[PDB]
From a paper:
NLRP1 is also an adapter protein, which along with ASC bind to themselves or each other by homotypic interactions among the death domain (DD) contained within them (e.g., PYD, CARD).
An investigation of different linkers between MBP and ASCCARD found a linker that allows the crystallization of MBP-ASCCARD. The structure was refined to 2.0 Å resolution and exhibits excellent agreement with the cryo-EM structure of ASCCARD in filaments with an root mean squared deviation (RMSD) of 0.502 Å31. We generated a high-resolution crystal structure of human ASCCARD and discovered that CARD structures are highly conserved with a six-helical bundle with a Greek key topology. We found that the Type I interaction mediated by the residues from helices 1 and 4 (Type Ia) of ASCCARD and residues from helix 2 and 3 (Type Ib) of a second ASCCARD is highly conserved. The Type III interaction formed by residues at helix 3 (Type IIIa) of one ASCCARD and residues at helix 3–helix 4 corner (Type IIIb) of a second ASCCARD is also less conserved. Structure-directed mutagenesis on ASCCARD demonstrated that the three interaction types of the DD superfamily play critical roles in ASCCARD oligomerization. Site-directed mutagenesis on the Y2H construct of ASCCARD showed that only the double mutants of D143A/E144A and N128A/E130R grew on SD/-Trp/-Leu/ plates instead of SD/-Trp/-Leu/-His plates, demonstrating the roles of D143, E144, N128, and E130 in the interaction between NLRP1CARD and ASCCARD.
Residue numbers in the entry: 1 to 459
Write the structure that this text describes.
């Protein structure tokens, strides 16, 4: 369904998709080829479902951590840049898009979280995490708060979890050891325990998400946030005089954010592989194309040597790279998505007091290499489950409360009912998710078996 002779691109909604569209309207202005830029919700979860059916985009943009799983699933075309083009990008970015010795995507830009602070509220940002509670007590007297950031995505809390010793998968003897997971060790527990103590002492709210924290910082209600380069654009538009600096230390050790390399992969099922090769090598990864995107939403430290040189003088980019050097490059192994789902649940349940830090991380450690059926097939289940009330009755009193049950029933359509149902699942642990799978098996076995079958077809 990917029609030949055009280019469809998926990029995340927080990136500069209008800047990328400008690169595509010039590509169309030169070669006659139309390119459409799209930013669907959960594109990175849907791509494995739509690529295998000959749909989805020609080019998918995401951070490199998802790409090893796509490559293992046969969903990405091997990219064959010349040795002369490879020299235009830094070698460590090519390493991030290398899976089994082969290049599976084009590196675009290096991303790391930084501490972003309001210089009018906070001329001297805290050097340590341990200072933040006293800061917040001082700024609550003025009607403000110290810090707000997204607690719903584990990416934003990971720098604190890794500071004192948490890690994802240990790199040993040239490869990531998936039997050596570090999310429930003492250092991980110490970091998450500090986060929980911030919530307990009313220095943070467990409900804070991306838009709440962005709105709070950009309206001058909070003195700091934690975010990446893509967010700077909306702060420039605000009236906030902001700085970008090193993340606070924790127990005297740097916060260790996971470093992402924004990357562009080519659908293995695309009949436009060489039109995507030419758009990526000759129109995006130029100084002109990267500036069209970076001027929409900043990219961070771009992988193209010639343009990075120009932008490296930005103190915001210098701070991004200081944080990046204290952190670690994300693995790209297929187990990363299961790892992220496991840590999302642990962080959300610890923050809300539904689990202790110890229990939440112990559960995450056990599940870090196994991707659950309903997480893998969320979008297809929303679209294709037909008897929602039967699932609701099977979950009532085990996994669904009456307040949750009523919220789902109040939704008008089956996809919107399932959407609402799935909005509760980040807090469910493995056995709760198993209950939904067993209910689906009893009422719609053909659907489960269909999804299982197509997943195995990728191996
Ligand atoms: O929490 C569930 C979530 O886990 C996985 O998402 C992770 C991304 O794979 C990972 O790249 C990182 O995402 C951040 C991007 O790197 C960055 O460009 C920017 O957009 O912020 C993103 C975080 O919001 O971290 C997330 C985990 O937080 C998995 O791929 C998702 O499908 C899954 O929903």
């Amino acid at each position: 369904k990917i029609e030949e002779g055009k280019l469809v691109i998926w990029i995340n909604g927080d990136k500069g998709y209008n800047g990328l569209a400008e690169v595509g309207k010039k590509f169309e202005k030169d070669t006659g080829i139309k390119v459409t830029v799209e930013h669907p919700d959960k594109l990175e979860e849907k791509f494995p479902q739509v690529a295998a059916t000959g749909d989805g985009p020609d080019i998918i943009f995401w951070a490199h951590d998802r790409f090893g799983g796509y490559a293992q699933s046969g969903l990405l075309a091997e990219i064959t840049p010349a040795a002369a083009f490879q020299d235009k990008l830094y070698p460590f970015t090519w390493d991030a898009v290398r899976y089994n010795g082969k290049l599976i995507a084009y590196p675009i830009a290096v991303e790391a979280l930084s501490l972003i602070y309001n210089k009018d509220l906070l001329p001297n940002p805290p050097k340590t995490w341990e200072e933040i509670p006293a800061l917040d007590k001082e700024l609550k007297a003025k009607g403000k708060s110290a810090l707000m950031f997204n607690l719903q995505e584990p990416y934003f809390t990971w720098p604190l979890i890794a500071a004192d010793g948490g890690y994802a998968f240990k790199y040993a003897a040239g490869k990531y050891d998936i039997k050596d997971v570090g999310v429930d060790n003492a250092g991980a527990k110490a970091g998450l325990t500090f986060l929980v103590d911030l919530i307990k002492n009313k220095h943070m709210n467990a409900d804070t998400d991306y838009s709440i924290a962005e709105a709070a910082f950009n309206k001058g209600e909070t003195a700091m946030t934690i975010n990446g380069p893509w967010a700077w654009s909306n702060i420039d538009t605000s009236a906030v005089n902001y700085g970008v600096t090193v993340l606070p230390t924790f127990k005297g050790q740097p916060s260790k954010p996971f470093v992402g390399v924004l990357s562009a992969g080519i659908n293995a099922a695309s009949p436009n592989k060489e039109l995507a090769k030419e758009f990526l090598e000759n129109y995006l990864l130029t100084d002109e194309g990267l500036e069209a995107v970076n001027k929409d939403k900043p990219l961070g430290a771009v992988a193209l040597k010639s343009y990075e040189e120009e932008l490296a003088k930005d103190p915001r980019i210098a701070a991004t790279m200081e944080n990046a050097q204290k952190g670690e490059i994300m693995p790209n192994i297929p187990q990363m998505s299961a790892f992220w789902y496991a840590v999302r649940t642990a962080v959300i349940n610890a923050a809300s007091g539904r689990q202790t830090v110890d229990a939440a991380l112990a559960a995450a450690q056990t599940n870090a290499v196994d991707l659950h059926f309903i997480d893998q097939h969320r979008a297809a289940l929303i679209a294709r489950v037909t008897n929602v009330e039967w699932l609701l009755d099977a979950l009532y009193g085990k996994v669904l409360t009456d307040e949750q049950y009523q919220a789902v029933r109040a939704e008008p359509t089956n996809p919107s009912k399932m959407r609402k149902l799935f909005s509760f699942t980040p807090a469910w642990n493995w056995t709760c998710k198993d209950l939904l799978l067993q209910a689906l098996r009893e009422s719609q076995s053909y659907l489960v078996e269909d999804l299982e079958r197509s997943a195995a077809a990728l191996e």
